[PDB]
Amino acid sequence: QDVVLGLYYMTRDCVNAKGEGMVLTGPKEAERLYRSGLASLHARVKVRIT
Amino acid sequence: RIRIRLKAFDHRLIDQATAEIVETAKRTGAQVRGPIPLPTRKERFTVLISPHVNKDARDQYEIRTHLRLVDIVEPTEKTVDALMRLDLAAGVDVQISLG
Amino acid sequence: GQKVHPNGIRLGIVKPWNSTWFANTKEFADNLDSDFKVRQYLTKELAKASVSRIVIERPAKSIRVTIHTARPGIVIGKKGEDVEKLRKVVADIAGVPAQINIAEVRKPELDAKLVADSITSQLERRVMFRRAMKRAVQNAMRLGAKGIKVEVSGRLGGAEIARTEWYREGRVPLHTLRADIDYNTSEAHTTYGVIGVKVWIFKGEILG
Amino acid sequence: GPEEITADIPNVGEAALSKLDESGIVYIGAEVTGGDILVGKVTPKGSDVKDSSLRVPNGVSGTVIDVQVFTRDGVEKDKRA
Amino acid sequence: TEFLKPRLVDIEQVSSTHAKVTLEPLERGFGHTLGNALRRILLSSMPGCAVTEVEIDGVLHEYSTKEGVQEDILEILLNLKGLAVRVQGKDEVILTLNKSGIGPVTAADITHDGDVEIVKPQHVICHLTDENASISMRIKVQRGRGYVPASTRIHSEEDERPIGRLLVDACYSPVERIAYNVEAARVEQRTDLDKLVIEMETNGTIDPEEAIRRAATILAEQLEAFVDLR
Amino acid sequence: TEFLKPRLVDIEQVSSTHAKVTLEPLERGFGHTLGNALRRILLSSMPGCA
Amino acid sequence: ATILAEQLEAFVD
Amino acid sequence: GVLKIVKVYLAVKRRIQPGDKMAGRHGNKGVISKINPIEDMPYDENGTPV
Amino acid sequence: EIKELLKLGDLPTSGQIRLYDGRTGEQFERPVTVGYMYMLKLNHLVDDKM
Amino acid sequence: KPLVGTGMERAVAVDSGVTAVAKRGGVVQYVDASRIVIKVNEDEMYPGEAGIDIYNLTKYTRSNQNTCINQMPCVSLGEPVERGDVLADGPSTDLGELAL
């Protein structure tokens, strides 16, 4: 119950947030942009995943 | 000036007392003179240890009364009174004397 | 009378004093007398209670007694009923305001005086002295004494010719000043006469 | 024979006579826990003595707040009664 | 490395207890780091003196009642647990409270020594109603940190104490509430600097610059394990 | 009033660009203090060039 | 760690 | 009949601990899980922890 | 009337305050509900069940 | 004292006899260490049997569920009380209300 709420709030999206439509060189700097305070947890973004 | 004469049998205890007194003085007032050690009284006693007779059989005891002279140069309002509530450890006869 | 008293030789180093006060030559004798009185009274009272050490300490015209006993419950009785009673009598004895504290003695088998007392009691109620001695020694050892010695002397088993017997176990260094040697004594007033019980208990060496 | 209320608790050493008086029973108040002794209550012939002395249950602490005794007309020693 | 260093520039006392303090200047982003670290340390690990053992005369246990008073003995122990003491020299002192007569027993009636300071002269403890009633308690004030309770201090105590001394729980920490704010600093040539406005709320016994200095020393000596060894 | 200093017990070097600094023991609620302080400094304050 | 220690180096004992 | 009748009244003082049961008035049962420190609590901007 | 009483006190009308985290010092997104509930301790204590 | 109550706390805390509700109104003498002593106003007071009401407070004792039933006085010394008013707060009561 708690963990599906944490995931459903995490992997979602909104039509404008901090860092809308910026491009990221990996998931590591995705978490670094979430922690430093430069993007939001749900902000649509092109990443490069492997 | 307040002269303070600490007297006790245990030296460590006396020392402890003196320090405490200094602390008490120094927070409230200013320019505590200092803990000056006077001469120790070594009051000796010889006694015959046999119940009946053997005179060369003896024990020689002594009581070492230590003296500590603490002086306070400026008696303020706050300082002198602070000692009233501030009693020292047992087995230490203190003797304050202003002037 | 060969040996020095083990407590007495160590008062400056590892053992402390019982009466712990300062007084000038004027009031000292009187104080001593008072101490003797109060202690005597206490012994008389708390015989059934296992009492080891009465520590008197008088600051500022007020006497502070500290009773070291194995069972506080019998000395205290109901909470502050017996202690209170004791206090006023103590005060009377002294002629000053009294204050009784009661220290609880952990491990009464390792306290020497208590052991001695027990032995004396046993002797009085007509046990085999030797068996009592053994018990005393064994118990202490079990409890964690680095060593113990006990000695009993005179009219043993009501015998006409008096003798002394003693049991040691572990190590009991008496010449070593830094050794914590709890020494104490007692006397069994039996039908045949007195039987004196000495006991030395070596807790361990102090390093300073 | 009848059972007895005495501190002179057996086999068990200087770990019986403690939170009680010289005539037996817990001495009131105190910081009693588990495995203590409250009321020395053991009989001879029951070198054949035993320990029925009601103690404190395992795991509990507490303070003896009250001791009631309307015992068999005799509970007294030489005089508390 | 173009960093700077902060200083305690202005220390305003809004009251004797509630008192703010600035910090200036902090670097960019450091404000929430130092503020949260000083918050955690200043709430967990400060030394303050508190009541530990209470000794009332003619008492058996703490659940009894007494002659001539309002609050019961558990109420007295709670009102004594709230006390705020500030000793200077020693680390373990014994106070004395003696009072008779009809009226409330404030904290200002304790016969103080020289090095103890009771900073709340309107802290009520008892309400003596009978004029023939008296109360003579002897408090014991240790000094530590954190929270050490009666259960753990039931066997921890080594110094074999006598029976009759009521054990009160020890709330040692004199900090109760702390908030920090990261404003915009007014630097005459820099715009990317910030100030930290720590808003403490003490027990009255602790001096705020001394508390901040001690928390800073705690943090630096904890980080020395990272600095020196690897 | 004396605090527990730790010993740095482990550097499990997984690769040349990987580490895991196992570190014990600290006072209750100090691991989060040290970890969060180091994490925010390492994210948004450590100097370097790119 | 030395960045934070030199940052806090001012008001210590 | 009964001879020796000794009743002793203990009084334990139980505090609160991980494992007790608390509840509101609405049916919200709960077993109190973690007894957190004051610092780790969620504080609002006024400073008071919850 | 709950909203109007929350306006007499200086509290926010929604009943919800923004709360920071005691661990990380940073704001919880999406403001949370804080209030006073009357919570009871039921007599099912854990050191009567262990 | 429940901040959000229904007002039926008063009737439950009075009507269950755990609080020491005053029988006859008046003032107070407040020895109270042992008992609340209430001097009675003259209108509620009988001609003979001059009379002042002495309430017994039940201090720390065992309930049926091993909880502690205890009464504490919630009136001071020299304070007017009326008939039907409460004097001693029982277990789980706060000034005559119901504080579970």
Q: Find, among C26, C55, J74, J45, the residue nearest to B91 by Cα.
A: C55
Q: List the single residue in H with minimal CA-CA distance to I18.
A: H44
Residues 28-87 of chain E with CB under 8 A from chain F are 28-30, 32-33, 36-37, 40-41, 44-45, 47
Q: Find, among J75, J2, J69, the residue nearest to J37 by Cα.
A: J75
Bond into C6 cis (ω within 30): no
DSSP assignment of F16-47:
TT---EEEE---TTTHHHHHHHHHHHHHHT--
**C158 touches E: beta carbon within 8 Å:** no
With CB atoms and an 8 Å threshold, state whether D27 touches C77: yes
- Separation of alpha carbons C93 and I17, rounded Å: 70
CATH of residue B88's domain is 3.30.70.600
Contacts of D10 (CB under 8 A, 6+ apart): D42, D49, D50, D51
Q: How far is E129 from chain F (nearest CA, A)?
A: 42
Q: Find, among C111, C143, C121, the residue nearest to C189 by Cα.
A: C121
Residue-number span of the structural domain to which B73 is assigned: 1-99
Q: How many H×J Cβ pairs under 8 Å? A: 3
Whether residue E59 sits in one domain with residue E160? yes
Whether residue E125 sits in one domain with residue E229? no
Contacts of J73 (CB under 8 A, 6+ apart): E70, J30, J32, J36, J57, J87, J88, J89
Work out the end-to-end distance of chain H between its first and last CA atoms, rounded to an integer number of angstroms. Answer: 59
Tell me if residue E19 falls in helix, strand or coil. Answer: strand
Segment holding A2, helix H or strand E: helix A2-10
Note the Cα D70 to chain centre separation in Å. 16
What approach was used to elucidate this structure?
Answer: cryo-EM
Give the per-residue SS3 of H1-50: CCCCCEEEECCCCCCCCCCCEEECCCCCEEECCCCCCCCCCCEECCCCEC
Resolution in angstroms for this experimental structure?
Answer: 3.8
CA angle J78, E137, E115 (to 5 degrees): 115
DSSP assignment of chain C:
--PPPHHHHTTTTTSPPSS-----TTTHHHHHHHHHHHHHHHHHHTSSS-EEEEEEE--SS-EEEEEEES-HHHHHTTTTTHHHHHHHHHHHHHTS-EEEEEEE-S-TTT-HHHHHHHHHHHHHTT--HHHHHHHHHHHHHHHT-SEEEEEEESSGGG-SS--EEEEEEE---SS-TTEEEEEEEEEEE-SS-EEEEEEEEEEEE---
What type of residue sits at position C31? N
Domain count, chain E: 2
CATH of residue E141's domain is 2.170.120.12
Q: Find, among E24, E29, E27, the residue nearest to E2 by Cα.
A: E27
Domain count, chain B: 1
Q: How many H×I Cβ pairs under 8 Å? A: 55
Q: How far is B41 from chain E (nearest CA, A)?
A: 30
Segment holding E217, helix H or strand E: helix E208-227
Any bridge partners for residue J40, and if so which? J26
Residue C183 main-chain phi, psi, to 5 deg: -105, 145
Pairing assessment for the beta strands E196-202 and E175-182 based on DSSP bridges = antiparallel
- Separation of alpha carbons C116 and C120, rounded Å: 6
Whether residue E167 sits in one domain with residue E95? yes
- Separation of alpha carbons A7 and A42, rounded Å: 11
Taking the CB of residue B42, how many other CB atoms lie within 10 A of it? 9
Q: Find, among E197, E180, I33, E15, the residue nearest to H45 by Cα.
A: E180
What's E48's DSSP letter?
Answer: E
Please count the residues of chain B: 99
Any bridge partners for residue E49, and if so which? E143
Q: Hey, where are the domains in chain C?
A: 16-106, 107-206
**Which residue in the set H15, H45, H47 is minimally distant from E178, CB to CB?**
H47
What type of residue sits at position E146? G
Contacts of I32 (CB under 8 A, 6+ apart): H42, I16, I17, I18, I19
Whether residue E167 sits in one domain with residue E54? yes
Residue-number span of the structural domain to which J85 is assigned: 18-92
Whether residue E211 sits in one domain with residue E99? no
Residue B34 main-chain phi, psi, to 5 deg: 150, 160
CA distances from F3 to C5, E155, F6, F27 (A): 45, 23, 10, 8
Q: How far is D30 from chain H (nearest CA, A)?
A: 10
Bond into E6 cis (ω within 30): no
CB E167 within 8 A of CB E53: yes
CB C205 within 8 A of CB C180: yes
Residues of J in contact with I1 (CB under 8 A): none
Residue-number span of the structural domain to which E141 is assigned: 48-172
CB E46 within 8 A of CB C66: no
With CB atoms and an 8 Å threshold, state whether D27 touches C109: no
Whether residue E138 sits in one domain with residue E113? yes
CA distances from G12 to A47, E216, F5 (A): 45, 6, 18
Whether residue E196 sits in one domain with residue E89? no
What type of residue sits at position J54? I
Residue J80 main-chain phi, psi, to 5 deg: -70, 135
Whether residue E125 sits in one domain with residue E55? yes
Q: How far is H30 from chain D (nearest CA, A)?
A: 24
Work out the end-to-end distance of chain C between its first and last CA atoms, rounded to an integer number of angstroms. Answer: 32
Whether D and F touch, i.e. at least 3 CB pairs below 8 A, reads as no
**H11 touches J: beta carbon within 8 Å:** yes
CATH of residue J80's domain is 2.40.50.100
Whether residue E229 sits in one domain with residue E121? no
Find where tokens 């007294």 sit: D76
